[PDB]
């Protein structure tokens, strides 16, 4: 009695390949037969914690600066907040080198050109809905939800201040800043860039940077 | 046949099923390693060639050792490639292909040492002799 | 063969002194469970030597060797 023969030596212990491989061959046979700009928001109203004048410190240097001194210093204004920033990013083989292409954060929204308006991906809110009047996606009833419910918003406030009732009802990310501990600012802004990057890469990666 | 036709994704799916069914067919490991090289997954391929050699051959199969050398070369591991090709040449010293590949790896090593100014005198003198 | 394997398992569990049931089970196990076949032939050998007090048949020794 012999159990291993010329036929059984070639066979698998229990798996059948025919169904899987013929499907693969059918796919191959079918082939042989031949069968971008993104956007983000900020508040223009001058009582806001982030302003058109200190914005580039908060977002570029990841450094909080009271606007008090910025106007007291006589600081001059940009037409809008668009950065061509350097940040060295690691290749899938691990070597880091920086590359950037237009991002626009909102500072003077109604001057915006027809090409750009509907680009919002993430959004810095002040609170009152009048901040968005005339913005596209604003619902004709005056409701801004088509922006905030589909887009990851941001709102910059002091840690101590009781959250704004519109913002708390709205789909907006709160950022808590200290009055006196300047060192705690950097991780907050890092969290901002983290969340913004998550959003851009998951939902607006096809937009160009 | 699918791999030879260049349909490496489909061929991978076939060989992956065969390896799932049996661990004892040497050619299934070689075919998978070849696909890993073609998909530029050199780190995995090198490991499959080394484990294939240790598991199925009681002697150094020069064709498999050459495939390992090829993977190490594409991986940029020129030092390991040199040593692997020398291991193959020790078994089959009359094979001109092994001699050619050794000469090529030696030239690449010398080219690298001579291209980078960080290389010291002992290194550069060795590179000159290798060239 | 799988049915036979099941029946002989029940037979050997109910009557572990039946040498023939152990040998028949061993012959079935040779195809898929070498350790099971060895255990079956070993049990038959043990029963033959300790209880039948008869020498081991050459066929069993050959199969155990294989």
């Amino acid at each position: 009695r012999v159990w291993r023969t010329r036929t059984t030596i070639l066979q698998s212990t229990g798996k059948n390949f025919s169904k899987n491989i013929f499907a693969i061959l059918q796919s191959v046979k079918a082939r042989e037969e031949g069968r971008r700009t993104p956007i983000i928001i900020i508040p223009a109203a001058t009582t806001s914690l982030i302003t058109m004048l200190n914005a580039k410190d908060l977002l570029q240097d990841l450094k909080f600066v009271p606007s008090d001194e910025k106007k007291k210093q006589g600081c001059q204004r940009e037409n809008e907040t668009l950065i061509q920033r350097r940040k060295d990013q690691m290749q899938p083989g691990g070597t880091a080198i920086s590359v950037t292409v237009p991002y626009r954060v909102v500072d003077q929204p109604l001057k915006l050109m027809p090409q750009d308006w509907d680009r919002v991906v993430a959004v810095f809110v002040q609170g009152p809905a009048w901040q968005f009047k005339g913005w596209p996606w604003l619902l004709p009833d005056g409701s801004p939800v088509d922006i905030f419910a589909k887009i990851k918003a941001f709102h910059l406030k002091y840690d101590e201040v009781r959250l704004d009732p519109n913002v708390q009802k709205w789909d907006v990310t709160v950022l808590e800043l200290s009055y006196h501990k300047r060192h705690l600012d950097r991780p907050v802004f890092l969290r901002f860039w983290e969340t913004l990057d998550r959003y851009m890469v998951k939902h607006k990666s096809h937009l160009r940077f | 046949v699918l791999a030879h036709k260049g349909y490496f994704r489909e061929a991978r799916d076939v060989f992956a099923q065969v390896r799932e069914a049996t661990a004892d067919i040497s050619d299934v490991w070689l075919n998978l390693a070849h696909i890993y090289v073609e998909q530029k997954q050199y780190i995995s391929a090198v490991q499959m060639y080394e484990n294939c050699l240790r598991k199925f051959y009681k002697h150094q199969n020069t064709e498999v050792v050459l495939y390992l050398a090829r993977a190490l070369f594409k991986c940029g591991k020129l030092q390991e490639c040199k040593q692997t090709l020398l291991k193959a040449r020790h078994v089959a010293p009359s094979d001109t292909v092994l001699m050619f590949n050794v000469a090529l790896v030696l030239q690449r090593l010398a080219t690298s040492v001579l291209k980078d100014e960080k290389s010291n005198l002992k290194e550069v003198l060795n590179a000159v002799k290798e060239l | 063969r799988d049915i036979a394997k099941g029946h002989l398992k029940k037979v050997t569990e109910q009557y572990p002194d039946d040498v023939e049931a152990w040998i028949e089970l061993a012959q079935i196990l040779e195809q898929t469970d070498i350790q099971g076949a060895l255990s079956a032939y070993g049990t038959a050998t043990r029963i033959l030597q300790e209880k039948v007090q008869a020498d081991v048949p050459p066929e069993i020794l050959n199969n155990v060797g294989a």
């Binding site: 009695r1 012999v2 159990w3 291993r4 023969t5 010329r6 030596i9 070639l10 | 046949v1 791999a3 030879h4 061929a11 067919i25 040497s26 050619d27 070689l30 075919n31 070849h34 090289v37 073609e38 064709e63 050459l66 495939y67 050398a69 090829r70 070369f73 594409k74 490639c81 292909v97 050619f100 590949n101 090529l104 | 012959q27 040779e30 050459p58 066929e59 050959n62 199969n63 060797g65 294989a66």
Partner: peptide, 27 residues
């Protein structure tokens, strides 16, 4: 353009059949 000289190695996808099994015979 001159193709950068690679390692001279022909990749062969093999399907070598196993040797015929002359296993010990059961009686």
């Amino acid at each position: 353009l001159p193709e950068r000289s690679g390692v001279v190695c022909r990749v062969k996808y093999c399907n070598s059949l196993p040797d015929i099994p002359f296993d010990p015979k059961f009686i």
